[PDB]
């Protein structure tokens, strides 16, 4: 299948990913500024798992401490989305995703933001991704060399590069008969970038309604 050293790496993110929610949106029935507590709780569950994965990433710990932070703060939103897609398509039984979308359309959170979220999820759903793909891709998002306020850009590449070479070769053998598939997956990294803009804009609106955020979210997003 794959190289000696590469198999060990692949076989280590992936276990890392296996081991560190929705249903309250599904029933007490609710959309919200009134239910905002549910949101921040979810985001906070996302941020906590983001951090616990990023530690486990090979060489992450060796980076400058401020660069470390920038990568985290730089990647919260993208990972929050990329993880939701694995929940939405890969893990929820039939019918749950349908009510979920519709509950959300009812949120009073406007389609300008809602429609891109759902089109992105479908598109990646239709991509039929394995756990290895979701895991590895998550780790590529996090190790994005170009994030703002990074001091030593070249250190972060050299750390992402290895993950990218696993994933190409992975696609090559387990979506053989689809050589474009590896480019498709990468486009999803491009696709995710846009949500930060939307975040910023949504975040700003919530401060003008004086909403409460958890400690953690306070730190990760400078509120």
């Amino acid at each position: 299948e794959l190289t000696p050293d590469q198999q060990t790496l692949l076989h280590f993110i992936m276990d890392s990913y296996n081991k560190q929610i929705t249903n309250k949106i599904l029933k007490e029935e609710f959309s919200a500024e009134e239910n905002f507590l549910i949101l921040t709780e979810m985001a906070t569950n996302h941020v906590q798992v983001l951090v616990e994965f990023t530690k486990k990433l090979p060489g992450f710990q060796t980076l400058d401490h401020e660069d470390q932070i920038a990568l985290l703060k730089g990647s919260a939103v993208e990972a929050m989305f990329l993880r939701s897609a694995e929940i939405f398509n890969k893990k929820l039984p039939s019918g749950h995703s349908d009510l979920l979308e519709e509950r959300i359309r009812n949120s009073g959170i406007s389609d300008e933001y809602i429609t891109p979220m759902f089109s992105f999820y479908k598109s990646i759903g239709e991509l039929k991704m394995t756990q290895e793909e979701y895991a590895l891709l998550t780790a590529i998002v996090i190790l994005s060399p170009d994030r703002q306020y990074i001091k030593d850009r070249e250190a972060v590449e050299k750390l992402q590069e290895p993950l990218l070479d696993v994933l190409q070769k992975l696609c090559k053998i387990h979506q053989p008969e689809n050589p474009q598939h590896f480019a498709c997956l990468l486009g999803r990294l491009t696709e995710l970038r846009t949500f930060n803009h939307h975040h910023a804009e949504m975040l700003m609106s919530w401060r003008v309604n004086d909403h409460k955020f958890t400690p953690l979210l306070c730190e990760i997003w400078d509120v």
Binding site: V51, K55, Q61, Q68, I69, L72, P215, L216, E219
Partner: peptide, 11 residues
Amino acid sequence: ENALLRYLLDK
């Protein structure tokens, strides 16, 4: 700042 992030990372 980012006291909590540093903590959660330095473990």
